[PDB]
């Protein structure tokens, strides 16, 4: 019993974090092989007025860099720019580089943040990509370069390099190809993120997990078909329900099918009571996450 937003064990990523320092800027970077990935605003003169990145890259001097893994300092061979990242060649190879891939995450997918400061991991926690391409995290100054990852059968998929905090407090990264999530700019401009909508397949996984935990006051008697729900969904801040097979196991263990949850989702969208600790509907648990905390295989 119990439901906790969890992270995967961080060990295979901890040894990849380095400190990247240029001038008076200092942030984190990701050291894979003989190259270090880090956000490009480390080379701006100021980060409170709009930055011209093509200028900053032209007047850049490698000797101005300071990159370190612990108290071992690495030397900078070359530096190229890709999207919002810098790719920094270094004269030292990371013997601890894990088997890795890059992946861009879609909304509703869960991953892990290794929150780093001054080149060292400080915390690990799981997040979920929202529809507005933001995440609800805990990052302060110095946190940029903090990677998001998933571990898959022994491969580390890197999907996120932290970049900025919007005026709302929501957090934005790029993927490891350099492309910002959601087309946001790495500028200190007033940016307002779009409406967020709940990834309803995760909301179902969460309601099932609540029914297993023995929470059942919210269940409803009526039932609505998937297609009817989908045309209500898009006007009430929820995504459409596409794949129903994912839940094929939860119903068995609960005796309540999706159609019963869909009709229940329409009621809660509510009245002072709680579900598994939550006061409104959350979309931050994937089905594969709930499967593990309820069963394990």
């Amino acid at each position: 019993a119990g439901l906790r937003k969890m992270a995967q064990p961080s060990g295979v990523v901890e040894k990849c974090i380095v400190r990247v320092c240029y001038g008076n800027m200092a942030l984190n970077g990701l050291w894979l092989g003989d190259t270090v990935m880090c956000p490009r605003h480390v080379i701006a003169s100021s980060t409170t007025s709009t930055i011209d990145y093509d200028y900053a890259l032209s007047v850049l001097r490698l000797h101005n860099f300071s990159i370190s893994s612990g108290n071992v300092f690495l030397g900078v061979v070359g530096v190229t720019m890709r999207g919002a990242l810098l790719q920094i060649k270094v004269n030292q190879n990371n013997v601890h580089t894990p088997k890795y891939t890059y992946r861009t995450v879609r909304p509703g997918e869960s991953f892990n943040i290794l929150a780093c400061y001054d080149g060292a991991a400080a915390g690990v926690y799981g997040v979920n990509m929202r529809s507005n391409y933001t995440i609800r995290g805990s990052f302060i100054n110095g946190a940029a370069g903090s990677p998001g990852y998933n571990i898959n059968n022994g491969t580390v998929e890197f999907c996120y390099l932290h970049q900025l905090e919007l005026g709302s407090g929501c957090h934005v990264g790029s993927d490891l190809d350099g492309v910002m999530y959601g087309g946001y700019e790495d500028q200190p401009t007033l940016q307002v993120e779009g409406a967020s909508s709940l990834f309803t397949e995760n909301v179902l996984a969460f309601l099932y997990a609540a029914l297993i935990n023995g929470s059942t006051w919210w269940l409803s008697s009526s039932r609505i078909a998937v297609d009817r729900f989908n045309e209500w969904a898009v006007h009430n801040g929820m995504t459409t329900v596409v794949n129903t097979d994912c839940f094929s196991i939860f119903a068995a263990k609960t005796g309540v099918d999706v159609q019963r949850l869909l009709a229940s989702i329409q009621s809660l969208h509510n009245g002072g009571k709680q579900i598994l600790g939550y006061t409104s509907l959350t979309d931050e648990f994937t089905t594969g996450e709930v499967i593990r905390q309820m069963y394990g295989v």
């Binding site: 946190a143 500028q187 200190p188």
Partner: peptide, 6 residues
């Protein structure tokens, strides 16, 4: 509020 590069 302006966005904060971190």
């Amino acid at each position: 509020k302006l966005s904060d590069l971190q």
